[PDB]
Amino acid sequence: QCVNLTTPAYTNSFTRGVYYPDKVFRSSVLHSTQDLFLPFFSNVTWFHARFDNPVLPFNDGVYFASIEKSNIIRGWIFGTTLDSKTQSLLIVNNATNVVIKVCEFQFCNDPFLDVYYHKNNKSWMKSEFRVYSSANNCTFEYVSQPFLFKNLREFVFKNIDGYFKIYSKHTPINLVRDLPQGFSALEPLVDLPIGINITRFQTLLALHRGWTAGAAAYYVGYLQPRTFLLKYNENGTITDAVDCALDPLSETKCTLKS
Amino acid sequence: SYELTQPPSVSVSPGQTASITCSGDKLGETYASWYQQKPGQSPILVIYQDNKRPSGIPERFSGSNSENTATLTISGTQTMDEADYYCQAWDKTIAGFGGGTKLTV
Amino acid sequence: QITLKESGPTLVKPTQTLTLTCKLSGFSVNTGGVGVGWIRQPPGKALEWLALIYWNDDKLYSPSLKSRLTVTKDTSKNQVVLTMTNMDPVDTATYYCAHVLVWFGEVLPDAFDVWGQGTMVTVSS
Ligand SMILES: *[C@@H]1O[C@H](CO)[C@@H](O[C@@H]2O[C@H](CO)[C@@H](O[C@@H]3O[C@H](CO)[C@@H](O)[C@H](O)[C@@H]3O)[C@H](O)[C@H]2NC(C)=O)[C@H](O)[C@H]1NC(C)=O
Ligand SMILES: *[C@@H]1O[C@H](CO)[C@@H](O)[C@H](O)[C@H]1NC(C)=O
Ligand SMILES: *[C@@H]1O[C@H](CO)[C@@H](O)[C@H](O)[C@H]1NC(C)=O
Ligand SMILES: *[C@@H]1O[C@H](CO)[C@@H](O)[C@H](O)[C@H]1NC(C)=O
Ligand SMILES: *[C@@H]1O[C@H](CO)[C@@H](O)[C@H](O)[C@H]1NC(C)=O
Ligand SMILES: *[C@@H]1O[C@H](CO)[C@@H](O)[C@H](O)[C@H]1NC(C)=O
Ligand SMILES: *[C@@H]1O[C@H](CO)[C@@H](O)[C@H](O)[C@H]1NC(C)=O
């Protein structure tokens, strides 16, 4: 079922990629924490979906964001060799549910979902699934509700002590082709007790027929071990954050807890 | 319901091509489908999404949809193709079947 | 394979309520993308669509009959039940249930691939 159809830019992520570091409720407080966060005012790699779906490094954790209207980006593949030799993690959002599996998958040279559209540009139907040819020795399976003006979706992927932890946020965006300037904290989505080695990942697109895609783009950044001062409002929501390693002004604010 | 008109009957000689039309208001915007019903039996899907056949349906059956008119064509019509043919179209979740065309051979 | 089986009363009186049950196999009513519709066919006449239910309990009804039609599904028995009230002699027909192909995103009905055998219901005194 594999189709051998073959032939970046950077943006400024001002104050984004911050997530609730734990599950402890806090309010009306400035709290200092140390964890893996996206550095402020960093160079985030910008890809377009003609589509770009290369294999990217995972490093110590991945900040992933997408802007789209037609729901082209459906999921991700995480692993090492990304073939039948090792276990790998497949996260895909289908028409009704999100399917998360860990198996010895044999992925296609260029994996994707094969869909077609109605005469209108809102409805769609599946034709086939062209991501892998096999899925042997499955160890983990989880099914839940889908992860899903353009739609902005942000995810943070961490892998600590065997747990693949996903944080997320979904907001509307009124920009044409870039990330918003402002602050928004990501919330815990799911904790997956998997126990596998991840060094690389790939983005899965829904393509249609040879095969093409509509207008969409996504951004990839990386997390670093940095100190942040998080501002919790009266309702316990983080409304601001200071990157203590950004500049001398932030250092002063973090030192004085203000 | 959705308004959808068919001819009352079609009559061809064996070996000829039968053509059954189906006229609506918005068939140029939505998808049409066709069913074949024999006497005493439930209808069988022959064409869906304008021109796609289900597995098991003979290559004799084809069709199209343009200018708000949909058609079903039977090439090399056999005497075993005698049946009442119906067209269907959905207007944004509003169903509608045609009156049905009696095809004789 | 996929199959559907209609059952229920084959005779009701005027002003009585008819209940028809569609017993299905090969798929579950709780499975995404699944829908089951009801269609009737009076003797010598064309098919008329009545209603269909989606796996997510969303429902579509024919505007002209909506006021008399209720559709529910049994999530344990894999059965779809149609209730049609206040029937008149003119409502005599063969009733069918069938599988519905469904478009996603903006959810729409497409076509009926697998049909049941159908059951004849007469309305008379
Ligand atoms: C999107 O993915 C989900 C999860 O894979 C799909 O739901 C699953 O669909 C399969 C059928 O394709 C169901 O299998 C059935 O399992 C029962 C036993 O529980 C068995 O008796 C049946 O014969 C059949 O094997 C599966 O249970 C179901 N899982 C869940 C959680 O619903 C979903 O259908 C996919 N969406 C689309 C549009 O395909
Ligand atoms: C796709 O091309 C690669 C070479 O880049 C080859 O190794 C692989 O076997 C091909 N797969 C198919 C299905 O043609
Ligand atoms: C981002 O890249 C630009 C060059 O395109 C460079 O001038 C700038 O200093 C870089 N900023 C960071 C934080 O790396
Ligand atoms: C869907 O998009 C195509 C390309 O822009 C357009 O030609 C077509 O008319 C659109 N469909 C509808 C119902 O407008
Ligand atoms: C499961 O792994 C073993 C090796 O430990 C392998 O021999 C077996 O074939 C695998 N199962 C499947 C279905 O491939
Ligand atoms: C993951 O695999 C890479 C080689 O692909 C290896 O260098 C690294 O140490 C492995 N990590 C773990 C936790 O096994
Ligand atoms: C806290 O929640 C209340 C509603 O319960 C809202 O009126 C108030 O503005 C919120 N405070 C902040 C800082 O958002």
Residue numbers in the entry:
A (entry chain A): 14 to 20, 26 to 67, 78 to 176, 186 to 246, 257 to 305
B (entry chain L): 1 to 105
C (entry chain H): 1 to 125
What did the published study say regarding this structure?
The SARS-CoV-2 spike (S) glycoprotein is exposed at the surface of the virus and mediates entry into host cells. The S glycoprotein is subdivided into two functional subunits, designated S1 and S2, that interact non-covalently after proteolytic cleavage by furin during synthesis. The S1 subunit contains the receptor-binding domain (RBD), which engages the receptor ACE2 (5, 7, 9, 10), and the N-terminal domain (NTD) that recognizes attachment factors. The S2 subunit contains the fusion machinery and undergoes large-scale conformational changes to drive fusion of the virus and host membranes, enabling genome delivery and initiation of infection.
S2X303 stood out due to its greater cross-reactivity with variants, including B.1.351, P.1, B.1.617.1 and to a lesser extent B.1.617.2, compared to all other neutralizing mAbs evaluated. To provide a structural framework for understanding the S2X303 binding breadth, we characterized its Fab fragment bound to B.1.617.1 S using cryoEM. Specifically, the S2X303 complementary determining region 3-dominated paratope exclusively contacts residues 123–125 (along with the glycan at position N122), that are part of the NTD galectin-like distal β-sheet, and residues 144–154 within the supersite β-hairpin. As a result, S2X303 defines a new class of NTD-specific mAbs that differs from S2X333 (23), a canonical ultrapotent NTD-specific mAb, and from P008_056 (70), which interferes with biliverdin binding, with respect to their footprints and angles of approach.
